Amino acid sequence: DKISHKIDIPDSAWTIGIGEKFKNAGHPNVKYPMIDDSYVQGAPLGGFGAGTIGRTYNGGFSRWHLEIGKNKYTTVYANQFSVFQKVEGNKDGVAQVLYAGEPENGYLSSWKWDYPKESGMYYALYPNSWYTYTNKDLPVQLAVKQFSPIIPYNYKETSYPVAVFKWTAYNPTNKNVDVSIMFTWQNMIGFFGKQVNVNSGNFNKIIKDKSKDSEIVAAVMGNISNDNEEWNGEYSIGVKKVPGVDISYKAKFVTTGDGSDLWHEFSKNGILDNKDDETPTKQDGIGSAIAVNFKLQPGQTIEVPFALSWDLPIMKFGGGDKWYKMYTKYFGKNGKNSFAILKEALNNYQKWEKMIDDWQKPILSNKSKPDWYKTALFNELYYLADGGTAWENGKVGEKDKRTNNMFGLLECFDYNYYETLDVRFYGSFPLVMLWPDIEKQVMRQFADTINVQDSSEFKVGSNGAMAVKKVQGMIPHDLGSSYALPWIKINAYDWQNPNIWKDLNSKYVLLVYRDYVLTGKTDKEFLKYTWKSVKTALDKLKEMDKDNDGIPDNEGIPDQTYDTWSMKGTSAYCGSLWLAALKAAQEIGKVLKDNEAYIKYNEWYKIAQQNFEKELWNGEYYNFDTESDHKDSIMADQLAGQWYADILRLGDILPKDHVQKALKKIYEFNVMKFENGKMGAVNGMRPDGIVDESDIQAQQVWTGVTYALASFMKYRGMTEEAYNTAYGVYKMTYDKSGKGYWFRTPEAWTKDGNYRASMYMRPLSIWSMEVNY
Numbered sequence: 035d036k037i038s039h040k041i042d043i044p045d046s047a048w049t050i051g052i053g054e055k056f057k058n059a060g061h062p063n064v065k066y067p068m069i070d071d072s073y074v075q076g077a078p079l080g081g082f083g084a085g086t087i088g089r090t091y092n093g094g095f096s097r098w099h100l101e102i103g104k105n106k107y108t109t110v111y112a113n114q115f116s117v118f119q120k121v122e123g124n125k126d127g128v129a130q131v132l133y134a135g136e137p138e139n140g141y142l143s144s145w146k147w148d149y150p151k152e153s154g155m156y157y158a159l160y161p162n163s164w165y166t167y168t169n170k171d172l173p174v175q176l177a178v179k180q181f182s183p184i185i186p187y188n189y190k191e192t193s194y195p196v197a198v199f200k201w202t203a204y205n206p207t208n209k210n211v212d213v214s215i216m217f218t219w220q221n222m223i224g225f226f227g228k229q230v231n232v233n234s235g236n237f238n239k240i241i242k243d244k245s246k247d248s249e250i251v252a253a254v255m256g257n258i259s260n261d262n263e264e265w266n267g268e269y270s271i272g273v274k275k276v277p278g279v280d281i282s283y284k285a286k287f288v289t290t291g292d293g294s295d296l297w298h299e300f301s302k303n304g305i306l307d308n309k310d311d312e313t314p315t316k317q318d319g320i321g322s323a324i325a326v327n328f329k330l331q332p333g334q335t336i337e338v339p340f341a342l343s344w345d346l347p348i349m350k351f352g353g354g355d356k357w358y359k360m361y362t363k364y365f366g367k368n369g370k371n372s373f374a375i376l377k378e379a380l381n382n383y384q385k386w387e388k389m390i391d392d393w394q395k396p397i398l399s400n401k402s403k404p405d406w407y408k409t410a411l412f413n414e415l416y417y418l419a420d421g422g423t424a425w426e427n428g429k430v431g432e433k434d435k436r437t438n439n440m441f442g443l444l445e446c447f448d449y450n451y452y453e454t455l456d457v458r459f460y461g462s463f464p465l466v467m468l469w470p471d472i473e474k475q476v477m478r479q480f481a482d483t484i485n486v487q488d489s490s491e492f493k494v495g496s497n498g499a500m501a502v503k504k505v506q507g508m509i510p511h512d513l514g515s516s517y518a519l520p521w522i523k524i525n526a527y528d529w530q531n532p533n534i535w536k537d538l539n540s541k542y543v544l545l546v547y548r549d550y551v552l553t554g555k556t557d558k559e560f561l562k563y564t565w566k567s568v569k570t571a572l573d574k575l576k577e578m579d580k581d582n583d584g585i586p587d588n589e590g591i592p593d594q595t596y597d598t599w600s601m602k603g604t605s606a607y608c609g610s611l612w613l614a615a616l617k618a619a620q621e622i623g624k625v626l627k628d629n630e631a632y633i634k635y636n637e638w639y640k641i642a643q644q645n646f647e648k649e650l651w652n653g654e655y656y657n658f659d660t661e662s663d664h665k666d667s668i669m670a671d672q673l674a675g676q677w678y679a680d681i682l683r684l685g686d687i688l689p690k691d692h693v694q695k696a697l698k699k700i701y702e703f704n705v706m707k708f709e710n711g712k713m714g715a716v717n718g719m720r721p722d723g724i725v726d727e728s729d730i731q732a733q734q735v736w737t738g739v740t741y742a743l744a745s746f747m748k749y750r751g752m753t754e755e756a757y758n759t760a761y762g763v764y765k766m767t768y769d770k771s772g773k774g775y776w777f778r779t780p781e782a783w784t785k786d787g788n789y790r791a792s793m794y795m796r797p798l799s800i801w802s803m804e805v806n807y
């Protein structure tokens with residue numbers, strides 16, 4: 035391996051061998067059906083709201099999120115980089131597809147598959163990833179750096195449906211070597227959203243652009259129809275000419291055949307036929323190829339950039355709404371713009387690279403933080419682009435711009451709900467810290483729902499009761515599902531009735547105040563916008579105080595985020611959240627000079643604080659609640675309210691000394707007595723040091739709960755404890771001794787390591803460990 039010295043891969047990059055098998059992989063621990071796409075994953079490509087593409091550590095384009103809100107795991111074998119090499123003065127060269135695998139069909143059987151083991155590495159530090167190719171049979175060594183321009187405080191390039199592939203080639207040998215790198219791509223118009231004749235009318239064309247200071251060759255893959263449907267638009271692949279390099283192409287090869295139409299050219303001399311053919315296919319799948327060929331002398335290095343774009347301007351949800359995607363603001367809405375997106379990337383990728391480095395550098399260069407932590411911190415951000423992310427630039431048919439662009443991130447794919455509020459309380463930290471205009475938009479979406487009333491009835495899944503869908507003054511659980519109508523039909527969740535949950539209204543308030551504090555305490559307009567909704571939220575929750583202790587009563591059913599774990603009376607969780615939310619509203623009262631509100635929330639806070647301490651402090655920790663079976667259980671999340679109060683700079687809601695003791699107890703029990711502290715914090719533990727078995731949720735580690743608990747510890751000066759607590763999450767996710775959840779971090783696992791709900795929003799909470807950014 036001499037190529038690694040020629041490129042700049044940080045030490046904290048997640049690493050795995052191309053072709054490596056992994057023996058210890060977790061699987062779902064529920065009886066019911068649940069996504070398991072295996073451990074062959076990698077860092078995603080594509081912007082926010084653009085639909086994303088998951089290219090795996092094996093090289094295949096396999097995890098498809100281009101249909102917004104859906105997850106389709108299937109390798110499109112035609113999509114690859116391939117290499118040709120011939121040493122000067124030998125009869126024949128070698129040609130090899132850079133994919134550690136082979137088609138399951140008999141399609142493309144002429145290509146050279148099964149890139150060998152022990153012959154390269156994959157590296158990820160999102161939004162960059164890299165592959166190195168160090169193969170006995172390839173004398174010139176190659177590396178590619180691939181990324182999308184995902185840039186904090188940038189709402190433009192961050193939306194783009196584009197990926198750059200920057201290749202570096204090095205000849206360490208004493209002989210001249212001819213090299214070709216070829217990009218192949220299937221014309222994927224109809225891969226989704228077409229019910230029949232999925233390839234019909236698809237056609238490819240070649241664009242040669244010789245503009246100012248660049249020559250670019252590209253293939254544009256489209257369809258002859260000018261319909262404005264979810265399925266229609268263009269893909270493009272292409273390359274920028276650099277000195278010492280020639281370009282060739284093939285406009286059309288058949289992906290539903292043996293592939294020799296392309297490969298017989300490539301495997302001869304790494305040079306394609308430059309054959310155009312714009313005729314449209316009917317039943318056969320088609321694709322295009324772009325190749326570069328060059329000669330490398332001993333010790334010579336060369337760099338050449340390829341790119342991929344996809345212009346699929348329309349997203350469709352299951353209820354029938356059709357929206358334009360955010361990037362159409364910058365490139366247009368007609369689905370004919372793939373080349374423009376590509377050309378932007380090819381001419382500006384160096385600038386985008388420097389911008390990525392500029393945002394990563396302050397964490398990367400802090401040598402007081404261990405590399406493993408940097409690995410998790412950056413890589414968990416995969417979920418922002420990958421979580422079914424929807425970012426609308428208008429409804430189809432509207433003739434003018436709206437004043438706002440609505441946004442939604444899925445909780446996950448198995449529970450297909452946008453912006454789950456009990457979840458985003460933990461999971462939205464990267465948004466507020468790095469894309470705060472998106473964050474504030476999401477919270478304004480929630481503000482607008484507060485007084486929405488929907489009297490229609492639904493059957494509650496857990497107990498078969500009938501409940502009203504949406505009650506005035508109660509915050510919704512979510513903003514809809516991709517199977518229905520995101521942003522229009524709310525509360526898609528129906529396992530419990532969220533209109534009687536005791537955490538949502540509080541978490542809403544704390545999220546509002548958080549967004550103000552963490553963006554510099556200057557945005558009074560945001561507090562003004564949200565103020566009525568905050569006051570309404572807290573007032574409705576006060577009404578759920580049955581026994582007059584100043585605190586909402588949990589009703590003996592699961593009426594909060596732990597949605598099968600019953601709480602009754604005053605709970606540590608909902609009670610601390612309530613306290614913190616009252617103190618937050620007092621502050622907002624002060625900022626907005628609203629004396630009535632300030633005085634009311636102060637008086638409610640005083641009563642409630644006093645009673646909380648009395649009812650639940652036991653000398654070592656705070657009890658789970660006042661009235662349940664196992665009410666003395668140690669809950670890992672018992673002081674979630676004080677966690678948020680530290681972040682919001684609201685001070686002590688509970689005595690300093692009592693907090694410190696409860697956290698040391700949580701570490702001593704929930705962490706260190708659960709599999710030797712190597713798997714995170716288990717949610718519930720009996721004071722005898724044994725896992726609480728009152729419910730499955732008590733026996734789970736929640737990844738986002740645990741990272742948040744580490745933030746809390748860290749800010750209370752329990753540094754060792756914080757990082758040890760977080761380490762178990764990292765280990766399970768990324769390490770060879772874990773369970774193979776890289777780029778699909780789940781909600782939860784049990785002591786055996788098996789999971790629930792891969793690709794989950796909550797563990798974005800890791801960014802709460804970085805709160806001064």
Ligand SMILES: OC[C@H]1O[C@@H](O)[C@H](O)[C@@H](O)[C@@H]1O
Pocket residue numbers: 445449451454456457527594595596597781
């Ligand atoms: O694991 C529990 C989670 O399950 C999801 O189905 C719900 O939407 C969340 O509200 C809940 O916190």
Ligand SMILES: [Ca+2]
Pocket residue numbers: 578579580581582583584585586587603604
């Ligand atoms: Ca009460």
